[PDB]
Amino acid sequence: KVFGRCELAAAMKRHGLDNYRGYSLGNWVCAAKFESNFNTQATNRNTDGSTDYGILQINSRWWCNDGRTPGSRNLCNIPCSALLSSDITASVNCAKKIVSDGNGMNAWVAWRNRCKGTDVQAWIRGCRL
Ligand SMILES: [Cl-]
Ligand SMILES: [Cl-]
Ligand SMILES: [Cl-]
Ligand SMILES: [Cl-]
Ligand code: NA
Ligand code: NA
Secondary structure, eight states, rough: OOOOHHHHHHHHHTTOTTTTTTTTTEEEHHHHHHHOOOOOOOOOOTTTTTTETTTTTTTTTSSSOOSTTTTTOTTSSSSGGGSSSSSTTHHHHHHHHTTTSGGGGSSHHHHHHHTTSOOGGGTTEEEEE
16 A cells, blocks of 8 residues: 555554654654655565565564564564555554664664654644644
8 A cells, every 4th residue: 555645644643653752753754755655565675685564664684574584583573564564553563663672763774864853744744633
């Protein structure tokens, strides 16, 4: 599913991401924009052989099982395919674990490089939330 901007903001808020670990909703929408262009089915292979899945491009190296990432973990206890669903519950619940792991949203390199420090509230501007 390819979400609209305000549609995704609303879904993320319904699933408890607004101000989660102190990160306002616009941070999460901005991260999703540059990780996946709001497409739940996005996948990308990393140079190390791991793969990133879903709206927030969560990595099979640590967070989900795809059966093809040697030496990896599955800390969210989900198949990576669950991160591709039109229902964002699995991605949100796993993102909550990731952002709590010590480095906040810096875990998402695209957030650090493209969202951090910017006017992220623009990403939810005008949305009925
Ligand atoms: Cl957009
Ligand atoms: Cl915001
Ligand atoms: Cl594996
Ligand atoms: Cl933080
Ligand atoms: Na990525
Ligand atoms: Na894994």
